[PDB]
Amino acid sequence: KRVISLEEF
Amino acid sequence: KRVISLEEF
Amino acid sequence: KRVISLEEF
Amino acid sequence: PFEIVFEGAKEFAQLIETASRLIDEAAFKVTEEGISMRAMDPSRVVLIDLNLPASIFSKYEVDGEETIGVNMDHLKKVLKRGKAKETLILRKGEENFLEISLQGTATRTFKLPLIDVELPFTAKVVILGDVIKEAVKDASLVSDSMKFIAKENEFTMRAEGETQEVEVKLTLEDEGLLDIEVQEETKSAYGISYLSDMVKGLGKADEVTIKFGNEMPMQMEYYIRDEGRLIFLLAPRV
Amino acid sequence: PFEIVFEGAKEFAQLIETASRLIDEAAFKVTEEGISMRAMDPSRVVLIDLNLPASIFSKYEVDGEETIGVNMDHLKKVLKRGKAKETLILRKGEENFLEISLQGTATRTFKLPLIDVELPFTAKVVILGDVIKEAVKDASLVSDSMKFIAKENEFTMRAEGETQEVEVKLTLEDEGLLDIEVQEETKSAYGISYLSDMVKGLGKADEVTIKFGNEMPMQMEYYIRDEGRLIFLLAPRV
Amino acid sequence: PFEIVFEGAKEFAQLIETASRLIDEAAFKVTEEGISMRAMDPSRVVLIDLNLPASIFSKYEVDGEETIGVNMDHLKKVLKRGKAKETLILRKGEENFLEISLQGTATRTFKLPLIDVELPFTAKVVILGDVIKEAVKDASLVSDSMKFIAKENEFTMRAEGETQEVEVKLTLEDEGLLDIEVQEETKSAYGISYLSDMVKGLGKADEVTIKFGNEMPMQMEYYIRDEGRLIFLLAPRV
């Protein structure tokens, strides 16, 4: 459910 | 013009 | 740009 | 505990999309005979009867009788997902759920909860599907209602507005009237909003039967495959 | 007291749907020659002339001359009902009514009331229907107006906005310029809203003639069947 | 100072219309290798990489390297104007402008200003374009997100809402799974809004590769012609 960002990968 | 119901038939 | 009328031709 | 398989799934969605157009909910009686849907629109002006008998399914495994109720909107939307040549499987286990699967390149299964459930005809006309679809659409341009008039050997639908008027005659000569059978002069008028839903999606090759009585309800009937049938009872105006 | 029959009714609806796109009402002069429509849009910037001569009808029975005026919206909507291969019959009796009938599987007749009625061209270009339909649509992406420029042996439509610009060159080499005939350099600009209505529905195979003068009105002409014609006179910008 | 010619222009508009669907602006690196576009949507949840190598162009004349930035909306709208069999020529002179020309019956040239510029995958699945396009559309009916689950020899996409649920199984038997390669059980969930843009316009014959990791981003890859490629990196949910 919680949409994160690409920056952390 | 006068729309009736199906119940009366 | 300035739209005229047909009447003048 | 049933498993029901219909070929030509897009076709099956169509029939249900008809029934969806006037009612918001519906009961499906599954039995070893076939599937039945019976239902009246919110304002009790139209009555739908769908009969889908075992023969039109490629597999039909019913155990006794039960009664499915479904959100027809959510059913319409799932059934719209079927492709024309794809296979439809309907399934019910102990749990209150309808399993709907479509099979093609891949198989997709959708689970939908079950919800809670709930004439002396003078004239009879047979008519191609295009003629009546066209007349209804023609009539909608001029009025909110259409008149049906049947004298012996000739059949007329007409409508009139303030300014403009429409009339479509057929005698047995006319190319899309297959049959007419009238005991006496018969005249009745019906609302166009309902007629439009009733006839939306009716091919040239579709024999449509209509039974009517002077100021009394119309019965419209056409077949699904050969064995199955859809009948609409429509109350009249004035 | 006339009876006029046109084959290819969908085609007839098309021509009228053009004329409907810029004017709200129109006069139809019926005569034993043919049918005529002449009319100017509300803001007197465009002028339409339709000539439909007797030959393009399969039956043409006129008695003298009269002048029909019709609600073009209600006419557009009735004429849209015709199928492509269906027959159109137009009819007028003593009563102020236009009988329009379409015949196919069944015949449908619609009655519509009658209402009350009411250049030194430098360059001439002939051009396929697709080229100009495309240029107008290309130009609409960047500006509300399009320039037409004709030098000897070369024909350009161009338009410019704040950021973006469009230009379509044709010389006699270019595949969709049939003909060009210019006495002197000719440059004029026309509003795109009107051009879009004028060229909407113009096939690859449609020879369109355009006559223009430096800052003076465009005359656009194309044929209906062989004998009949539609001419649009469009006032220019600045 | 480049001149780049692509056959099948409608095709070229399609690829760009994909890239337009998630980002508002984009950089095009032109080099003697090919054309490159790299870009992230406003919320840095998706990353697009387009590679269009020289071979897929009928003429490819680049002098060194420069970097075009364009309004993707205005580019989308110009590129939509190309017909399917028409030729696309892209051109850049010293001035900050992209010349786009489409050639058919006539040649039209549009000038658009330049603007300012600016993983340890467990599972890998190959899948036909239709299967995934269908699953995404199926899933959107029930939820705003879709789960991807890969065990050895079997591949599942599933989504669940309040009432209704969807699941699409594939094993190597299933007709539209070409290939699957999973090191360990892999489960991740992705938003449907992004997936819909990613898979909108994917034929039956389109091999789509998807690499995913337990709660980590999806990499979706499919080819343009043979040499060119589009890769989408999509961050996951929770």
XYZ file of C-alpha atoms in Angstrom:
741
model
C 0.000 0.000 0.000
C 2.770 2.488 1.019
C 4.239 3.938 -2.227
C 7.944 4.673 -1.887
C 10.447 6.241 -4.268
C 13.029 4.779 -6.672
C 15.825 6.831 -5.092
C 16.286 4.191 -2.303
C 17.458 1.329 -4.483
C -48.491 9.947 -21.641
C -49.441 8.728 -18.104
C -46.940 5.965 -17.149
C -48.550 3.300 -14.984
C -47.136 0.214 -13.291
C -47.066 -3.484 -14.246
C -48.656 -4.484 -10.930
C -52.190 -3.744 -12.316
C -52.273 -6.424 -14.985
C -5.477 38.561 -37.439
C -8.337 41.111 -37.910
C -11.415 39.147 -39.123
C -13.543 41.199 -41.499
C -16.849 40.472 -43.212
C -17.756 39.226 -46.707
C -20.061 42.204 -47.292
C -17.068 44.400 -48.378
C -16.126 42.488 -51.504
C -21.363 -26.570 -5.717
C -21.744 -25.969 -9.501
C -19.476 -25.699 -12.552
C -20.969 -24.141 -15.712
C -19.046 -23.570 -18.969
C -20.220 -21.320 -21.861
C -18.377 -20.923 -25.175
C -18.423 -17.481 -26.827
C -18.042 -15.466 -23.615
C -18.361 -12.003 -25.224
C -21.805 -13.207 -26.348
C -22.657 -14.165 -22.682
C -21.524 -10.654 -21.465
C -23.900 -9.086 -24.071
C -27.033 -10.874 -22.710
C -26.136 -9.927 -19.123
C -25.300 -6.300 -20.262
C -28.929 -6.173 -21.581
C -30.385 -7.349 -18.249
C -27.997 -4.915 -16.461
C -29.397 -1.893 -18.421
C -32.766 -1.639 -16.542
C -32.212 -3.473 -13.268
C -29.486 -2.784 -10.605
C -29.652 -6.251 -9.000
C -30.873 -9.711 -10.023
C -31.369 -13.259 -8.822
C -29.867 -16.171 -10.739
C -31.593 -19.465 -10.034
C -29.182 -22.275 -10.918
C -30.896 -25.703 -11.341
C -30.075 -28.941 -13.246
C -32.552 -27.662 -15.899
C -30.670 -24.423 -16.551
C -30.051 -20.881 -15.331
C -32.910 -18.422 -14.745
C -33.016 -14.670 -14.052
C -36.223 -12.896 -13.106
C -36.406 -9.245 -12.081
C -38.167 -5.894 -12.245
C -36.648 -2.476 -12.650
C -36.798 0.002 -9.650
C -40.107 1.602 -10.878
C -41.848 -1.795 -11.649
C -42.583 -0.720 -15.265
C -40.442 -3.484 -16.899
C -40.019 -7.181 -16.065
C -37.110 -9.304 -17.359
C -37.159 -13.099 -17.706
C -33.925 -14.784 -18.928
C -33.896 -18.581 -19.500
C -30.522 -20.189 -20.241
C -31.012 -23.984 -20.499
C -28.243 -26.577 -19.967
C -27.838 -27.381 -23.726
C -26.189 -23.975 -24.532
C -23.312 -24.785 -22.114
C -20.350 -27.046 -23.081
C -20.286 -28.306 -19.450
C -23.156 -27.999 -17.001
C -22.535 -29.586 -13.539
C -25.203 -28.438 -11.027
C -25.913 -30.242 -7.717
C -29.595 -29.533 -6.845
C -30.796 -25.874 -6.630
C -29.450 -22.560 -5.156
C -29.956 -18.835 -5.844
C -27.115 -16.408 -6.585
C -27.584 -12.651 -6.123
C -24.869 -10.354 -7.561
C -24.017 -6.657 -7.993
C -25.002 -6.506 -11.742
C -22.628 -3.507 -12.263
C -19.600 -5.458 -10.956
C -20.793 -8.536 -12.952
C -21.268 -6.434 -16.150
C -17.653 -5.069 -15.709
C -16.117 -8.535 -15.120
C -18.092 -10.134 -18.046
C -17.061 -7.215 -20.413
C -13.431 -8.510 -19.935
C -14.172 -11.689 -21.924
C -12.982 -11.823 -25.516
C -15.355 -13.082 -28.243
C -13.826 -16.575 -28.718
C -12.895 -17.077 -25.042
C -14.438 -19.632 -22.696
C -16.504 -18.582 -19.668
C -16.552 -20.849 -16.546
C -18.952 -20.020 -13.689
C -18.332 -21.728 -10.301
C -19.724 -21.775 -6.759
C -18.275 -23.425 -3.667
C -19.598 -23.355 -0.101
C -18.362 -19.769 0.415
C -20.606 -16.883 -0.674
C -18.644 -16.107 -3.898
C -19.116 -16.462 -7.629
C -15.886 -17.611 -9.335
C -15.955 -16.270 -12.923
C -13.057 -17.424 -15.152
C -12.243 -16.429 -18.734
C -9.770 -18.642 -20.585
C -7.528 -17.615 -23.483
C -3.759 -16.936 -23.792
C -3.911 -17.156 -19.980
C -6.745 -17.943 -17.500
C -8.101 -15.188 -15.279
C -10.433 -15.854 -12.345
C -12.568 -13.226 -10.613
C -14.304 -13.716 -7.298
C -17.459 -11.701 -6.685
C -19.371 -11.840 -3.333
C -22.990 -12.998 -3.333
C -25.457 -10.447 -1.914
C -29.133 -10.777 -0.791
C -31.889 -11.779 -3.264
C -34.811 -9.271 -3.796
C -52.229 -11.824 -20.544
C -55.053 -11.540 -23.176
C -52.748 -10.417 -26.037
C -54.737 -9.229 -29.049
C -51.869 -8.699 -31.527
C -48.718 -10.769 -32.106
C -46.022 -9.514 -34.502
C -42.709 -11.147 -35.563
C -40.137 -8.621 -36.869
C -36.420 -8.523 -37.719
C -34.118 -7.050 -35.054
C -32.924 -4.175 -37.245
C -36.466 -2.815 -38.083
C -37.495 -2.254 -34.399
C -34.017 -1.071 -33.344
C -34.297 1.560 -36.087
C -37.890 2.590 -35.289
C -37.075 3.151 -31.620
C -34.033 5.232 -32.542
C -36.073 7.121 -35.193
C -38.887 7.833 -32.646
C -36.464 9.049 -29.947
C -35.617 11.979 -32.274
C -39.178 13.378 -31.994
C -40.746 12.134 -28.722
C -40.266 10.330 -25.363
C -42.895 7.703 -26.414
C -43.796 5.429 -29.322
C -47.230 4.049 -30.382
C -47.678 0.490 -31.718
C -50.735 -0.058 -33.939
C -51.771 -3.387 -35.437
C -54.641 -3.828 -37.919
C -55.074 -7.034 -39.949
C -52.179 -7.554 -42.437
C -50.380 -4.211 -41.525
C -48.178 -3.121 -38.586
C -47.291 0.479 -37.611
C -45.003 2.157 -35.088
C -45.376 5.860 -34.895
C -44.362 8.789 -32.623
C -45.136 12.536 -32.653
C -43.611 15.473 -30.847
C -44.442 19.180 -30.762
C -43.100 19.974 -34.304
C -41.929 16.679 -35.894
C -43.550 13.226 -36.438
C -42.274 9.681 -37.370
C -44.137 6.620 -38.759
C -42.803 3.219 -39.966
C -45.409 1.046 -41.820
C -44.980 -2.738 -42.418
C -47.364 -5.108 -44.303
C -46.433 -8.740 -44.972
C -44.779 -7.421 -48.187
C -42.269 -5.409 -46.166
C -38.944 -7.187 -46.078
C -38.323 -7.352 -42.290
C -41.863 -8.324 -41.067
C -41.729 -12.192 -40.897
C -45.202 -12.651 -39.296
C -48.345 -10.858 -38.024
C -51.398 -12.316 -36.202
C -54.023 -9.766 -34.949
C -57.500 -10.672 -33.592
C -58.737 -7.071 -33.502
C -57.413 -3.533 -33.948
C -54.722 -3.041 -31.304
C -53.190 0.286 -30.183
C -50.773 0.942 -27.300
C -47.968 3.413 -26.404
C -44.656 2.719 -24.567
C -41.806 4.896 -23.248
C -38.758 5.140 -25.549
C -36.112 5.102 -22.722
C -37.180 1.493 -21.892
C -37.566 0.419 -25.563
C -34.002 1.698 -26.312
C -32.490 -0.512 -23.544
C -34.675 -3.434 -24.714
C -33.592 -3.391 -28.413
C -29.957 -2.081 -28.122
C -27.880 -4.821 -29.834
C -30.307 -6.655 -32.161
C -28.867 -7.871 -35.490
C -30.654 -7.932 -38.893
C -30.868 -11.775 -38.299
C -32.769 -11.769 -34.951
C -36.481 -12.764 -35.034
C -38.170 -10.609 -32.354
C -41.715 -11.444 -31.299
C -43.962 -8.744 -29.809
C -47.399 -9.367 -28.255
C -49.578 -6.345 -27.415
C -53.100 -5.351 -26.351
C -55.095 -2.107 -26.577
C -53.706 0.028 -23.686
C -51.944 -3.002 -22.129
C -48.273 -4.188 -21.693
C -45.959 -5.313 -24.442
C -44.252 -8.690 -24.357
C -41.012 -8.749 -26.342
C -39.231 -12.029 -26.872
C -36.030 -13.122 -28.634
C -33.799 -16.182 -28.415
C -30.280 -16.746 -27.067
C -28.540 -19.497 -29.105
C -31.608 -21.790 -29.906
C -32.790 -23.082 -26.480
C -32.380 -19.933 -24.390
C -34.670 -16.946 -24.310
C -35.131 -13.405 -23.097
C -38.599 -11.941 -22.490
C -39.374 -8.372 -21.532
C -42.736 -7.337 -20.143
C -43.262 -3.598 -20.506
C -46.153 -1.638 -18.954
C -47.691 0.955 -21.329
C -48.569 4.645 -21.252
C -52.018 5.982 -20.325
C -46.067 19.258 -54.843
C -42.687 17.534 -55.496
C -41.214 14.030 -55.221
C -37.401 13.723 -55.286
C -35.480 10.433 -54.936
C -31.716 10.141 -54.195
C -29.792 6.854 -54.044
C -26.977 6.563 -51.479
C -28.767 8.425 -48.677
C -25.854 8.384 -46.187
C -23.957 10.313 -48.881
C -26.847 12.902 -49.050
C -26.767 13.294 -45.185
C -22.983 14.014 -45.429
C -23.416 16.994 -47.838
C -26.197 18.463 -45.676
C -24.097 17.785 -42.468
C -21.383 19.987 -44.114
C -23.837 22.836 -44.798
C -25.237 22.350 -41.244
C -21.759 22.904 -39.655
C -21.593 26.726 -40.211
C -25.194 27.806 -40.719
C -28.192 27.234 -38.334
C -30.885 27.664 -41.015
C -31.054 27.461 -44.815
C -33.320 27.915 -47.805
C -33.779 25.109 -50.320
C -34.993 26.318 -53.694
C -36.620 23.380 -55.487
C -37.021 23.919 -59.283
C -37.326 21.611 -62.344
C -33.586 22.334 -62.895
C -32.507 21.019 -59.494
C -32.184 21.833 -55.800
C -30.278 24.902 -54.571
C -29.126 26.040 -51.114
C -27.643 29.471 -50.524
C -26.760 30.841 -47.095
C -24.373 32.758 -44.863
C -23.243 31.906 -41.376
C -24.426 34.159 -38.428
C -21.281 36.414 -38.626
C -21.386 36.784 -42.501
C -17.769 35.523 -42.826
C -18.671 32.386 -44.887
C -21.129 31.866 -47.755
C -22.360 28.416 -48.863
C -23.730 27.592 -52.322
C -24.972 23.997 -52.899
C -26.202 22.982 -56.392
C -27.847 19.560 -56.715
C -29.088 19.142 -60.320
C -31.883 16.754 -61.396
C -29.491 14.162 -62.978
C -28.115 12.976 -59.562
C -31.645 11.880 -58.508
C -33.216 8.549 -59.628
C -36.623 10.327 -59.719
C -37.103 14.078 -59.881
C -40.772 15.254 -60.094
C -41.025 19.026 -59.420
C -44.071 21.150 -60.377
C -42.783 24.736 -60.929
C -40.808 26.470 -58.105
C -41.110 26.801 -54.263
C -38.715 27.476 -51.362
C -38.354 25.195 -48.333
C -36.858 26.495 -45.075
C -35.953 23.899 -42.399
C -34.381 23.619 -38.931
C -30.954 22.322 -40.203
C -30.303 20.642 -36.789
C -33.536 18.596 -36.987
C -32.794 17.888 -40.706
C -29.171 16.834 -39.911
C -30.543 14.410 -37.197
C -33.210 12.894 -39.501
C -30.744 12.551 -42.471
C -28.088 10.897 -40.149
C -30.660 8.013 -39.765
C -30.170 6.926 -43.396
C -27.968 3.914 -44.041
C -25.329 4.065 -46.809
C -27.177 1.949 -49.431
C -30.677 3.187 -48.509
C -32.928 5.306 -50.712
C -33.896 8.867 -49.752
C -37.297 10.271 -50.915
C -38.078 13.965 -50.325
C -41.742 15.079 -50.664
C -43.894 18.194 -50.271
C -47.675 18.482 -50.322
C -49.824 21.575 -49.792
C -49.212 21.502 -46.015
C -46.091 23.203 -44.631
C -44.124 19.937 -44.076
C -41.163 18.148 -45.591
C -41.791 14.377 -45.830
C -38.380 12.642 -45.656
C -38.454 8.843 -46.169
C -35.597 6.339 -45.960
C -36.237 2.910 -47.467
C -34.541 -0.354 -46.494
C -35.698 -3.447 -44.530
C -38.693 -1.210 -43.739
C -39.693 2.337 -44.843
C -39.605 5.171 -42.328
C -41.132 8.590 -43.008
C -40.369 11.753 -41.037
C -42.383 14.938 -41.230
C -40.559 18.183 -40.498
C -42.368 21.594 -40.438
C -41.248 24.307 -42.850
C -40.125 27.547 -41.161
C -39.490 31.086 -42.558
C -36.764 31.734 -45.178
C -33.937 34.231 -44.236
C -14.183 38.361 -57.769
C -10.740 39.201 -59.325
C -9.058 35.923 -58.232
C -5.299 36.035 -58.774
C -4.428 32.416 -57.883
C -6.301 29.185 -58.655
C -5.100 25.878 -57.168
C -6.480 22.321 -57.625
C -5.514 19.955 -54.766
C -6.481 16.495 -53.484
C -8.946 16.404 -50.570
C -6.519 14.711 -48.176
C -3.677 17.331 -48.569
C -5.836 20.342 -47.461
C -7.704 18.342 -44.792
C -4.291 17.481 -43.331
C -2.845 21.010 -43.586
C -5.822 22.525 -41.774
C -5.561 19.918 -39.022
C -1.753 20.397 -38.867
C -2.158 24.230 -38.623
C -4.816 24.016 -35.881
C -2.102 22.534 -33.610
C -0.105 25.809 -33.668
C -2.492 28.702 -34.472
C -6.113 29.896 -34.959
C -5.263 30.959 -38.573
C -3.589 29.641 -41.720
C -1.824 31.568 -44.547
C -2.141 30.548 -48.222
C 0.723 31.661 -50.489
C 0.898 31.064 -54.232
C 3.927 31.897 -56.404
C 4.298 30.535 -59.953
C 4.705 26.704 -59.980
C 4.650 26.358 -56.091
C 1.848 26.435 -53.479
C 2.267 26.905 -49.697
C 0.009 26.781 -46.648
C 1.648 27.843 -43.473
C 0.706 28.825 -39.879
C 2.718 30.091 -36.882
C 1.913 30.400 -33.211
C 3.844 31.770 -30.240
C 6.345 28.827 -29.993
C 5.613 26.405 -32.883
C 5.254 26.796 -36.700
C 3.852 24.617 -39.589
C 4.432 24.795 -43.386
C 3.281 22.439 -46.201
C 4.945 23.109 -49.627
C 3.561 21.760 -52.961
C 5.063 22.199 -56.483
C 3.574 20.431 -59.510
C 5.910 17.514 -58.592
C 4.089 16.987 -55.300
C 1.745 14.043 -55.565
C -1.554 15.653 -54.435
C -1.339 19.026 -56.317
C -3.225 18.333 -59.629
C -3.111 21.957 -60.931
C -1.902 25.525 -60.210
C -2.585 28.758 -62.170
C -1.263 32.032 -60.588
C -1.152 35.442 -62.352
C 0.911 37.123 -59.629
C 2.213 36.427 -56.123
C -0.840 35.838 -53.930
C -0.945 35.822 -50.101
C -3.990 35.619 -47.805
C -4.867 34.299 -44.302
C -8.090 32.544 -43.138
C -9.446 31.375 -39.762
C -8.919 27.661 -39.005
C -12.326 27.119 -37.247
C -14.073 27.813 -40.612
C -11.512 25.861 -42.712
C -11.972 22.790 -40.419
C -15.774 22.746 -41.029
C -15.160 23.332 -44.765
C -12.749 20.376 -45.324
C -14.037 17.841 -42.692
C -14.839 14.718 -44.778
C -12.739 15.036 -47.964
C -11.328 11.781 -49.395
C -7.903 11.288 -51.067
C -9.951 11.120 -54.375
C -11.699 14.544 -54.183
C -10.401 17.315 -56.511
C -10.783 20.569 -54.526
C -10.375 23.877 -56.336
C -9.342 27.005 -54.412
C -9.279 30.543 -55.857
C -7.629 33.307 -53.801
C -6.437 36.922 -53.987
C -3.944 38.974 -51.956
C -5.883 39.864 -48.748
C -9.215 38.789 -50.316
C -11.725 35.867 -49.831
C -11.119 32.251 -50.686
C -13.431 30.328 -52.983
C -13.370 26.584 -52.333
C -15.195 24.272 -54.686
C -15.742 20.503 -54.901
C -18.257 18.290 -56.680
C -21.136 16.115 -55.456
C -21.536 13.077 -57.770
C -20.536 14.694 -61.191
C -23.238 17.354 -61.845
C -23.670 18.760 -58.340
C -21.394 21.177 -56.565
C -20.580 22.856 -53.288
C -18.851 26.254 -53.165
C -17.686 28.048 -50.054
C -16.801 31.725 -50.054
C -14.645 32.602 -47.059
C -13.694 36.155 -46.017
C -10.019 36.509 -44.973
C -8.067 37.911 -42.037
C -6.651 41.450 -41.930
C 23.355 19.489 -37.388
C 21.587 16.092 -37.787
C 19.177 14.443 -40.235
C 17.377 11.278 -39.058
C 14.799 9.349 -41.124
C 12.402 6.681 -39.731
C 9.979 4.637 -41.848
C 6.589 3.766 -40.320
C 6.028 7.119 -38.599
C 2.762 6.171 -36.834
C 4.850 3.459 -35.142
C 7.415 6.149 -34.017
C 4.543 8.337 -32.582
C 3.345 5.275 -30.559
C 6.719 4.788 -28.758
C 6.932 8.510 -27.940
C 3.193 8.510 -26.853
C 4.217 5.780 -24.318
C 7.101 7.874 -22.937
C 4.752 10.925 -22.931
C 2.193 9.116 -20.670
C 4.225 9.341 -17.390
C 6.713 12.148 -17.961
C 5.955 15.810 -18.964
C 9.442 16.543 -20.355
C 12.387 14.496 -21.639
C 15.932 14.714 -22.929
C 16.867 13.169 -26.267
C 20.570 12.454 -26.592
C 21.411 12.236 -30.298
C 24.782 10.509 -31.017
C 26.291 8.619 -34.007
C 25.354 5.420 -32.082
C 21.646 6.240 -31.896
C 18.981 8.210 -30.043
C 18.511 7.908 -26.267
C 15.800 9.133 -23.875
C 16.176 8.875 -20.118
C 13.710 10.342 -17.633
C 11.738 10.016 -14.414
C 8.143 10.925 -13.775
C 7.366 13.941 -11.437
C 7.093 11.691 -8.294
C 10.319 9.651 -9.069
C 8.392 6.330 -8.880
C 9.029 5.341 -12.556
C 12.139 5.610 -14.744
C 12.045 5.369 -18.563
C 14.993 4.374 -20.763
C 14.427 4.416 -24.567
C 17.254 3.256 -26.892
C 16.747 3.797 -30.630
C 19.929 2.687 -32.462
C 20.977 3.912 -35.937
C 19.998 0.633 -37.736
C 16.201 1.245 -37.317
C 16.489 4.494 -39.351
C 16.607 4.540 -43.199
C 18.990 7.548 -42.966
C 20.975 8.505 -39.888
C 23.307 11.549 -40.320
C 24.547 12.798 -36.907
C 27.593 15.087 -36.467
C 29.013 14.368 -32.962
C 26.686 14.676 -29.902
C 23.977 17.148 -28.673
C 20.937 16.976 -26.364
C 17.417 17.994 -27.407
C 14.777 18.858 -24.793
C 11.151 19.183 -26.002
C 7.621 19.826 -24.694
C 6.501 16.117 -24.868
C 2.816 17.225 -25.165
C 3.528 19.359 -28.266
C 5.779 16.535 -29.623
C 3.069 13.877 -28.941
C 0.512 16.091 -30.863
C 2.841 16.672 -33.856
C 3.894 12.946 -34.023
C 0.167 11.825 -33.825
C -0.238 13.607 -37.251
C 1.893 10.970 -39.015
C 0.085 8.300 -41.000
C 1.118 4.636 -40.610
C 3.064 4.271 -43.904
C 4.463 7.831 -43.906
C 8.119 8.775 -43.506
C 9.366 10.724 -40.476
C 12.416 13.056 -40.864
C 13.925 14.670 -37.746
C 16.326 17.628 -38.266
C 18.352 20.133 -36.239
C 20.219 23.203 -37.453
C 22.128 25.779 -35.407
C 18.880 27.407 -34.202
C 17.144 25.972 -31.124
C 14.397 24.125 -33.094
C 13.460 20.567 -33.949
C 12.278 20.275 -37.580
C 9.849 17.318 -37.751
C 8.618 16.419 -41.268
C 6.073 13.792 -42.321
C 6.032 12.853 -46.002
C 3.082 11.461 -47.961
C 0.720 12.959 -50.595
C 2.431 16.215 -49.558
C 5.294 17.021 -47.118
C 4.537 18.871 -43.897
C 7.251 20.319 -41.656
C 6.758 21.374 -38.035
C 9.209 23.449 -36.053
C 9.240 22.964 -32.291
C 11.501 25.057 -29.963
C 14.063 23.269 -27.801
C 13.662 23.888 -24.050
C 16.013 23.210 -21.068
C 17.110 19.647 -20.166
C 16.198 18.339 -16.620
C 19.654 -4.503 -9.090
C 19.683 -8.010 -7.452
C 16.641 -9.326 -9.395
C 15.420 -12.643 -8.000
C 12.750 -13.478 -10.611
C 12.779 -12.973 -14.392
C 9.633 -13.684 -16.438
C 9.051 -13.456 -20.230
C 5.355 -13.036 -21.162
C 3.277 -12.141 -24.233
C 2.079 -8.524 -24.463
C -1.618 -9.426 -24.368
C -1.443 -11.477 -21.072
C -0.016 -8.581 -18.945
C -2.129 -5.919 -20.696
C -5.179 -7.997 -19.743
C -4.086 -8.686 -16.145
C -3.493 -4.995 -15.458
C -6.894 -4.109 -16.902
C -8.518 -7.007 -14.973
C -6.848 -5.868 -11.683
C -7.880 -2.214 -12.143
C -11.518 -3.379 -11.784
C -10.936 -4.446 -8.145
C -7.970 -2.466 -6.732
C -5.439 0.388 -7.205
C -2.543 -2.152 -6.931
C -1.423 -5.512 -8.311
C 0.827 -8.193 -6.708
C 3.384 -10.193 -8.734
C 4.347 -13.587 -7.273
C 6.920 -15.947 -8.757
C 7.613 -19.469 -7.452
C 9.612 -22.013 -9.482
C 7.772 -23.031 -12.710
C 4.618 -20.850 -11.972
C 3.879 -17.103 -12.266
C 0.953 -15.221 -10.656
C -0.459 -11.700 -10.798
C -3.202 -11.040 -8.363
C -5.146 -8.078 -6.875
C -7.830 -7.784 -4.164
C -10.189 -5.006 -3.197
C -12.771 -4.643 -0.433
C -15.377 -7.038 -1.998
C -13.859 -8.507 -5.207
C -10.555 -10.305 -6.045
C -8.630 -11.191 -9.296
C -5.858 -13.771 -9.956
C -4.180 -14.850 -13.246
C -1.969 -18.008 -12.953
C 0.659 -19.014 -15.588
C 2.917 -22.137 -15.587
C 5.168 -22.958 -18.547
C 2.125 -24.836 -19.969
C 0.151 -21.601 -20.233
C 0.122 -20.380 -23.802
C 1.433 -16.798 -23.342
C 4.278 -17.441 -20.801
C 7.401 -17.914 -23.043
C 9.950 -18.104 -20.161
C 10.407 -18.043 -16.353
C 13.656 -18.030 -14.301
C 13.263 -17.626 -10.475
C 16.080 -18.112 -7.908
C 13.768 -17.940 -4.887
C 10.149 -17.131 -4.040
C 9.558 -13.535 -5.133
C 6.618 -11.289 -4.139
C 6.111 -7.574 -4.861
C 3.201 -5.120 -5.402
C 2.977 -2.173 -7.870
C 0.446 0.621 -8.498
C -2.006 -0.030 -11.362
C -2.079 3.615 -12.669
C 1.630 3.244 -13.650
C 1.258 -0.351 -14.961
C -1.665 0.774 -17.218
C 0.501 3.487 -18.885
C 3.389 0.985 -19.155
C 1.446 -1.795 -20.987
C -1.134 0.284 -22.997
C -0.517 -0.797 -26.630
C 1.158 -4.235 -26.414
C 0.211 -6.754 -29.133
C -0.244 -10.546 -28.708
C 3.178 -10.793 -30.550
C 5.316 -8.673 -28.150
C 7.756 -10.547 -25.846
C 7.809 -8.545 -22.580
C 10.482 -9.313 -20.003
C 9.889 -8.509 -16.321
C 12.536 -8.753 -13.573
C 11.403 -8.435 -9.939
C 12.595 -8.864 -6.345
C 10.790 -9.365 -3.021
C 9.556 -5.833 -2.104
C 11.804 -4.222 -4.762
C 11.277 -2.439 -8.170
C 10.086 -4.048 -11.359
C 12.072 -3.820 -14.572
C 9.899 -4.161 -17.672
C 11.539 -4.426 -21.056
C 10.302 -4.770 -24.648
C 11.849 -4.138 -28.053
C 11.239 -1.508 -30.742
C 11.890 -3.028 -34.208
C 14.811 -5.482 -33.334
C 17.701 -3.205 -32.207
C 15.782 -0.629 -30.174
C 14.435 -1.036 -26.683
C 12.254 0.455 -23.991
C 12.868 -0.271 -20.298
C 10.707 0.863 -17.416
C 11.920 0.797 -13.834
C 9.002 0.906 -11.412
C 9.320 1.354 -7.630
C 7.009 -0.957 -5.618
C 4.459 -0.625 -2.828
C 5.289 -1.083 0.866
